[PDB]
Amino acid sequence: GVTQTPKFQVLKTGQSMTLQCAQDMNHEYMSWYRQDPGMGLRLIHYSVGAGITDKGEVPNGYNVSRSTTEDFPLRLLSAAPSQTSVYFCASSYLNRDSALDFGPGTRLTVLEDLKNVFPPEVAVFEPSEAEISHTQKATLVCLATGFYPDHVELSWWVNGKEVHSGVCTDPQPLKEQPALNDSRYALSSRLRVSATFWQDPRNHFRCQVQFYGLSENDEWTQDRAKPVTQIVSAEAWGR
Amino acid sequence: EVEQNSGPLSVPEGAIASLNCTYSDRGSQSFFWYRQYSGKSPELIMFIYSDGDKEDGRFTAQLNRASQYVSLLIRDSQPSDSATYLCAVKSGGSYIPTFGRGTSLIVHPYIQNPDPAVYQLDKSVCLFTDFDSQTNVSQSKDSDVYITDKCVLDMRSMDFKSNSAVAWSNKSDFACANAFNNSIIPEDTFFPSP
Amino acid sequence: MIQRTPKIQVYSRHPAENGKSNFLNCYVSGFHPSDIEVDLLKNGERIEKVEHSDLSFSKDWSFYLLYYTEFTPTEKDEYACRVNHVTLSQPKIVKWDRDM
Amino acid sequence: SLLMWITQV
Amino acid sequence: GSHSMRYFFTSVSRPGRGEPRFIAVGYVDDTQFVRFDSDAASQRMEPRAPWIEQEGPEYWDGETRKVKAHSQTHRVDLGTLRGYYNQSEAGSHTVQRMYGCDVGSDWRFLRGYHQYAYDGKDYIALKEDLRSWTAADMAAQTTKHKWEAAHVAEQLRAYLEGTCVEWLRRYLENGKETLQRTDAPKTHMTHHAVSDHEATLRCWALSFYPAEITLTWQRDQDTELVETRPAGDGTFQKWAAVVVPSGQEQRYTCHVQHEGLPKPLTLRWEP
């Protein structure tokens, strides 16, 4: 299908970056959309084939090139805070009935200063004894707290295998200081299993939060550790 | 060009979800429905070009060129159908499909045997769980207390859905009895004393 | 993999009159593939400012092409068209006969 | 004016 | 009278030389009016006639975008057709496409066309009904089933019966004095000896438009006939010859039929 890299990115105002988009389906048509809370999908640039690109609804601040069938990179010339968005690459054939095929997407956050970037603290809280006797079930909750920007992927792992059955994660995080403009975030998730599975001490439960922040490329002069891209896990065993 | 009400639209599990989308250009040729889960990419469900109905499993696209609208009906709606549904239209004078802003659909699960309860698990965490789908959890009065919105989990192997809401605070004032005072809780909600 | 040999016709736009302005044409047609080399010659020397039409084809899929240039024919000057193609092992010269 | 909708072989 | 608009596309692969060659040309009747060449400097659909130049920037951006989209389709098709016939990467191959529409005396739709060739051979063509495909071999039957599934015929039939005829009528009104003219052939005969007993009679037709013309000999065998050829100024030329026994040239006649001539001409040479 359509691949695009990177999936998350932090930039400081004024930096350049190129969002890659590649497809292996010999689509003639290729496009770049941005998606923002209030405004839906808006078209940046498109290309009906190699050697032609065209402007969309919101082209300003962006460049594209189409020198090959497969690739259609989007360059940000001088990163601005208003370019903070989710970016989708979309390609299709040229039949009347051809539908767009969208890439996984690229969450970009452009900041004035990188000092607000923090990774998450992660904690697993074990099930209530009262829940176990009352419902014959055991709910673990995981809290991911104090992170910025909102660039996290939470997952539950049971005995080394990722699980989706009996999992709820919040669609959006909470602002810890809702008044403050550059507020750090909190996210929660639940893993529910039967009491039989929890109370068995052989079983091992891990809440994993992949945080996307700075790279080795970026500079860091602060006293605290560089808030790099990292996986932060919290653990639990049965009782 | 292409208009869509944003929602959210609430539908009970099992009922028909009805999503609409109008368009201004009579020269429109093909019409598309994409589904986008929260934090994921839009994915095609189905397209339609000829006037009438088109069935594909639980989905039915409906096109009416005289009144200039496209519809998506979802029979036997499930909680996993909760998503943003994007309408797109391709036309005669361009290769660019025209998108509507998308309609958010939430399908509330049918809880068979409601068992509303508030359990206790730096920081302590209270879990308001097993409650009815008509219960709306409200945000906190106090700012040091954080409360998440209700969340639907699905234990596949046992076919058991469950609503849940989490709350926490580092304050020693905070207790699980206090947690959800601002919400209209069910009258017979279980509050154990560990 | 089928190949077709070009048919060459060398001629003038108007009926030739000595010491009078005209055009010299070389019309190559019926060939395949499209890759072809066409020069117009004056007394065995390649003429430099030679224009050509945009590649098109006939109902049988074979290509046709008009190569042309401006010239003033005289009694003694000899004009030709030299054409090379994969079907031809050597470049083929066709002399301009003013009654063909 | 050229064709618009083109489908690959 | 009867009129037509055709587009001709030539796509050629260039192994180990990168980008394939793409050439596109548009005709109204026998008059070329537009072209695109991937090797040209502009990368635009360019005018090749005076009457088309009065179309505004919107037309040229649209056609350029459309032709660039044709080239991208064709670029992929070369690779796909290579796979179907299991051919090497190192050989050059050619794809051709022709489409267009006819109109009668009343300027209403008459017929439409969409044909497609690989290495100078029929691959797949749309029938006169405009709903159905002729596939020339097993590889083109794959393309047939794929184009039936994607409703290609329906989409082409919409273009051929609608857009194609509307733009043809528009070009016929814009280039009226070029396209609705009919130049009759100017004719003469030449005689040359080849022998004591034989002699060539050549019959000429010059400065005629359009190119459809018939030259035939009559007595009361050894007939040569060249391919109709462009003069380079919009008009066409053709000659026909016969080798005849000398002293009997008076009994041979050349016959010329052309829509510019109100009645067909008979030409005779006498010693």
PDB file of C-alpha atoms in Angstrom, chain A residues 67-214:
ATOM      1  CA  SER A  67      10.164  12.781 -10.781  1.00  0.00           C
ATOM      2  CA  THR A  68       9.055   9.103 -10.402  1.00  0.00           C
ATOM      3  CA  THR A  69       5.856   7.026 -10.442  1.00  0.00           C
ATOM      4  CA  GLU A  70       6.284   5.845  -6.831  1.00  0.00           C
ATOM      5  CA  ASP A  71       7.462   8.802  -4.709  1.00  0.00           C
ATOM      6  CA  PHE A  72       5.795  12.168  -3.978  1.00  0.00           C
ATOM      7  CA  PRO A  73       7.705  13.939  -1.165  1.00  0.00           C
ATOM      8  CA  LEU A  74       6.305  17.005   0.655  1.00  0.00           C
ATOM      9  CA  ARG A  75       8.901  19.584   1.737  1.00  0.00           C
ATOM     10  CA  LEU A  76       8.239  22.103   4.496  1.00  0.00           C
ATOM     11  CA  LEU A  77      10.491  25.038   3.622  1.00  0.00           C
ATOM     12  CA  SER A  78      10.308  27.028   6.871  1.00  0.00           C
ATOM     13  CA  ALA A  79       8.299  25.275   9.621  1.00  0.00           C
ATOM     14  CA  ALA A  80       5.565  27.402  11.258  1.00  0.00           C
ATOM     15  CA  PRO A  81       3.345  26.632  14.321  1.00  0.00           C
ATOM     16  CA  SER A  82       0.234  26.773  12.055  1.00  0.00           C
ATOM     17  CA  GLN A  83       1.652  23.785  10.093  1.00  0.00           C
ATOM     18  CA  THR A  84       1.158  21.660  13.241  1.00  0.00           C
ATOM     19  CA  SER A  85      -1.230  19.024  11.862  1.00  0.00           C
ATOM     20  CA  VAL A  86      -1.758  15.444  10.682  1.00  0.00           C
ATOM     21  CA  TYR A  87      -0.548  14.937   7.093  1.00  0.00           C
ATOM     22  CA  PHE A  88      -1.934  12.217   4.809  1.00  0.00           C
ATOM     23  CA  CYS A  89      -0.613  11.012   1.487  1.00  0.00           C
ATOM     24  CA  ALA A  90      -3.354   9.751  -0.861  1.00  0.00           C
ATOM     25  CA  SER A  91      -2.983   8.048  -4.262  1.00  0.00           C
ATOM     26  CA  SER A  92      -5.270   6.396  -6.829  1.00  0.00           C
ATOM     27  CA  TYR A  93      -5.755   5.242 -10.415  1.00  0.00           C
ATOM     28  CA  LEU A  94      -7.546   7.458 -12.992  1.00  0.00           C
ATOM     29  CA  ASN A  95     -10.752   5.431 -13.537  1.00  0.00           C
ATOM     30  CA  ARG A  96     -13.964   7.360 -12.732  1.00  0.00           C
ATOM     31  CA  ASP A  97     -14.565   4.957  -9.802  1.00  0.00           C
ATOM     32  CA  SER A  98     -10.979   4.964  -8.436  1.00  0.00           C
ATOM     33  CA  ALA A  99     -10.909   5.631  -4.705  1.00  0.00           C
ATOM     34  CA  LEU A 100      -8.033   7.180  -2.780  1.00  0.00           C
ATOM     35  CA  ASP A 101      -5.772   4.892  -0.767  1.00  0.00           C
ATOM     36  CA  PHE A 102      -4.416   6.751   2.292  1.00  0.00           C
ATOM     37  CA  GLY A 103      -1.066   6.322   4.028  1.00  0.00           C
ATOM     38  CA  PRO A 104      -0.794   5.784   7.824  1.00  0.00           C
ATOM     39  CA  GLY A 105      -0.238   9.533   8.284  1.00  0.00           C
ATOM     40  CA  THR A 106       2.277  11.942   9.792  1.00  0.00           C
ATOM     41  CA  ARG A 107       1.590  13.841  13.030  1.00  0.00           C
ATOM     42  CA  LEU A 108       3.670  17.014  12.963  1.00  0.00           C
ATOM     43  CA  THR A 109       4.066  19.461  15.841  1.00  0.00           C
ATOM     44  CA  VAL A 110       5.955  22.720  15.246  1.00  0.00           C
ATOM     45  CA  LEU A 111       7.058  24.505  18.445  1.00  0.00           C
ATOM     46  CA  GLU A 112       8.785  27.838  19.146  1.00  0.00           C
ATOM     47  CA  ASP A 113      11.035  26.169  21.759  1.00  0.00           C
ATOM     48  CA  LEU A 114      11.891  22.498  22.458  1.00  0.00           C
ATOM     49  CA  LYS A 115      11.987  23.043  26.288  1.00  0.00           C
ATOM     50  CA  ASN A 116       8.297  22.037  26.555  1.00  0.00           C
ATOM     51  CA  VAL A 117       9.030  18.525  25.176  1.00  0.00           C
ATOM     52  CA  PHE A 118       8.689  15.915  27.979  1.00  0.00           C
ATOM     53  CA  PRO A 119       8.369  12.102  27.823  1.00  0.00           C
ATOM     54  CA  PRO A 120       5.616  10.228  29.729  1.00  0.00           C
ATOM     55  CA  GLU A 121       5.811   8.730  33.185  1.00  0.00           C
ATOM     56  CA  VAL A 122       3.974   5.398  32.969  1.00  0.00           C
ATOM     57  CA  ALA A 123       2.307   3.484  35.815  1.00  0.00           C
ATOM     58  CA  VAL A 124       0.132   0.349  36.005  1.00  0.00           C
ATOM     59  CA  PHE A 125      -2.456   0.176  38.805  1.00  0.00           C
ATOM     60  CA  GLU A 126      -3.547  -3.340  39.833  1.00  0.00           C
ATOM     61  CA  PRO A 127      -7.231  -4.492  40.074  1.00  0.00           C
ATOM     62  CA  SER A 128      -9.501  -4.034  43.100  1.00  0.00           C
ATOM     63  CA  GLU A 129     -10.114  -6.998  45.434  1.00  0.00           C
ATOM     64  CA  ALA A 130     -13.764  -5.839  45.630  1.00  0.00           C
ATOM     65  CA  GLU A 131     -14.161  -5.949  41.814  1.00  0.00           C
ATOM     66  CA  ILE A 132     -12.841  -9.544  41.727  1.00  0.00           C
ATOM     67  CA  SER A 133     -15.376 -10.946  44.229  1.00  0.00           C
ATOM     68  CA  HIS A 134     -18.288  -8.786  42.940  1.00  0.00           C
ATOM     69  CA  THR A 135     -17.913  -9.396  39.158  1.00  0.00           C
ATOM     70  CA  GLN A 136     -15.349 -12.254  38.726  1.00  0.00           C
ATOM     71  CA  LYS A 137     -13.239  -9.804  36.660  1.00  0.00           C
ATOM     72  CA  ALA A 138     -10.028  -7.796  37.047  1.00  0.00           C
ATOM     73  CA  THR A 139      -9.470  -4.321  35.541  1.00  0.00           C
ATOM     74  CA  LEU A 140      -5.896  -2.985  35.302  1.00  0.00           C
ATOM     75  CA  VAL A 141      -5.586   0.730  34.476  1.00  0.00           C
ATOM     76  CA  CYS A 142      -2.489   2.329  32.968  1.00  0.00           C
ATOM     77  CA  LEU A 143      -1.729   6.044  33.324  1.00  0.00           C
ATOM     78  CA  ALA A 144       0.662   7.842  30.965  1.00  0.00           C
ATOM     79  CA  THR A 145       1.286  11.283  32.509  1.00  0.00           C
ATOM     80  CA  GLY A 146       3.197  14.531  31.992  1.00  0.00           C
ATOM     81  CA  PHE A 147       4.087  14.160  28.296  1.00  0.00           C
ATOM     82  CA  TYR A 148       4.305  16.748  25.492  1.00  0.00           C
ATOM     83  CA  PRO A 149       3.562  16.962  22.622  1.00  0.00           C
ATOM     84  CA  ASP A 150       0.566  14.590  22.173  1.00  0.00           C
ATOM     85  CA  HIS A 151       2.687  11.960  20.341  1.00  0.00           C
ATOM     86  CA  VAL A 152       2.019   8.620  22.039  1.00  0.00           C
ATOM     87  CA  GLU A 153       1.006   5.059  21.132  1.00  0.00           C
ATOM     88  CA  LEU A 154      -0.252   3.016  24.111  1.00  0.00           C
ATOM     89  CA  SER A 155      -0.395  -0.805  23.953  1.00  0.00           C
ATOM     90  CA  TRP A 156      -1.010  -3.655  26.431  1.00  0.00           C
ATOM     91  CA  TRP A 157       1.229  -6.753  26.310  1.00  0.00           C
ATOM     92  CA  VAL A 158       0.275 -10.075  27.957  1.00  0.00           C
ATOM     93  CA  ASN A 159       3.044 -12.719  28.305  1.00  0.00           C
ATOM     94  CA  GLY A 160       5.040 -11.021  25.513  1.00  0.00           C
ATOM     95  CA  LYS A 161       2.105 -10.867  23.041  1.00  0.00           C
ATOM     96  CA  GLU A 162       0.186  -7.667  22.266  1.00  0.00           C
ATOM     97  CA  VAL A 163      -3.540  -7.774  23.157  1.00  0.00           C
ATOM     98  CA  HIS A 164      -6.579  -5.878  21.818  1.00  0.00           C
ATOM     99  CA  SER A 165      -9.335  -7.995  23.451  1.00  0.00           C
ATOM    100  CA  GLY A 166     -10.566  -6.340  26.663  1.00  0.00           C
ATOM    101  CA  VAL A 167      -8.724  -3.043  26.082  1.00  0.00           C
ATOM    102  CA  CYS A 168      -9.982   0.548  26.229  1.00  0.00           C
ATOM    103  CA  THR A 169      -7.707   3.531  25.581  1.00  0.00           C
ATOM    104  CA  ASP A 170      -8.883   7.162  25.649  1.00  0.00           C
ATOM    105  CA  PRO A 171      -9.409   8.665  22.161  1.00  0.00           C
ATOM    106  CA  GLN A 172      -7.782  11.978  23.244  1.00  0.00           C
ATOM    107  CA  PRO A 173      -5.595  12.749  26.279  1.00  0.00           C
ATOM    108  CA  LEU A 174      -6.430  15.209  29.070  1.00  0.00           C
ATOM    109  CA  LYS A 175      -4.602  18.504  29.556  1.00  0.00           C
ATOM    110  CA  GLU A 176      -3.035  18.485  33.032  1.00  0.00           C
ATOM    111  CA  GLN A 177      -3.086  22.321  33.157  1.00  0.00           C
ATOM    112  CA  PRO A 178      -6.068  23.154  30.853  1.00  0.00           C
ATOM    113  CA  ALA A 179      -5.606  26.958  31.289  1.00  0.00           C
ATOM    114  CA  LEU A 180      -1.913  26.999  30.253  1.00  0.00           C
ATOM    115  CA  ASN A 181      -1.261  27.182  26.497  1.00  0.00           C
ATOM    116  CA  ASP A 182       1.631  24.697  26.266  1.00  0.00           C
ATOM    117  CA  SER A 183       0.142  22.149  28.681  1.00  0.00           C
ATOM    118  CA  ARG A 184       1.520  18.651  29.276  1.00  0.00           C
ATOM    119  CA  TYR A 185      -0.808  15.703  28.654  1.00  0.00           C
ATOM    120  CA  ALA A 186      -2.174  12.660  30.480  1.00  0.00           C
ATOM    121  CA  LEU A 187      -3.659   9.485  28.934  1.00  0.00           C
ATOM    122  CA  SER A 188      -5.347   6.421  30.468  1.00  0.00           C
ATOM    123  CA  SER A 189      -6.066   2.872  29.327  1.00  0.00           C
ATOM    124  CA  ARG A 190      -7.908  -0.155  30.781  1.00  0.00           C
ATOM    125  CA  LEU A 191      -7.157  -3.862  30.374  1.00  0.00           C
ATOM    126  CA  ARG A 192      -9.983  -6.100  31.589  1.00  0.00           C
ATOM    127  CA  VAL A 193      -9.590  -9.855  32.061  1.00  0.00           C
ATOM    128  CA  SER A 194     -11.331 -12.466  34.220  1.00  0.00           C
ATOM    129  CA  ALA A 195     -10.234 -13.018  37.830  1.00  0.00           C
ATOM    130  CA  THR A 196      -8.995 -16.498  36.807  1.00  0.00           C
ATOM    131  CA  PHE A 197      -6.437 -14.887  34.469  1.00  0.00           C
ATOM    132  CA  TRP A 198      -5.340 -12.085  36.866  1.00  0.00           C
ATOM    133  CA  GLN A 199      -4.986 -14.205  40.029  1.00  0.00           C
ATOM    134  CA  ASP A 200      -2.725 -16.748  38.244  1.00  0.00           C
ATOM    135  CA  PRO A 201       0.807 -15.504  39.207  1.00  0.00           C
ATOM    136  CA  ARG A 202       2.349 -16.991  36.006  1.00  0.00           C
ATOM    137  CA  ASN A 203       0.663 -14.247  33.903  1.00  0.00           C
ATOM    138  CA  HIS A 204       2.595 -11.015  33.213  1.00  0.00           C
ATOM    139  CA  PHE A 205       0.958  -7.712  32.134  1.00  0.00           C
ATOM    140  CA  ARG A 206       2.871  -4.792  30.593  1.00  0.00           C
ATOM    141  CA  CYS A 207       1.548  -1.354  29.609  1.00  0.00           C
ATOM    142  CA  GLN A 208       3.803   0.128  26.889  1.00  0.00           C
ATOM    143  CA  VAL A 209       3.882   3.776  25.751  1.00  0.00           C
ATOM    144  CA  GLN A 210       5.917   4.632  22.640  1.00  0.00           C
ATOM    145  CA  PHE A 211       6.748   8.358  22.873  1.00  0.00           C
ATOM    146  CA  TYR A 212       7.881  10.328  19.802  1.00  0.00           C
ATOM    147  CA  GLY A 213       9.949  13.424  20.597  1.00  0.00           C
ATOM    148  CA  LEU A 214      13.455  14.653  19.781  1.00  0.00           C
TER     149      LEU A 214
END
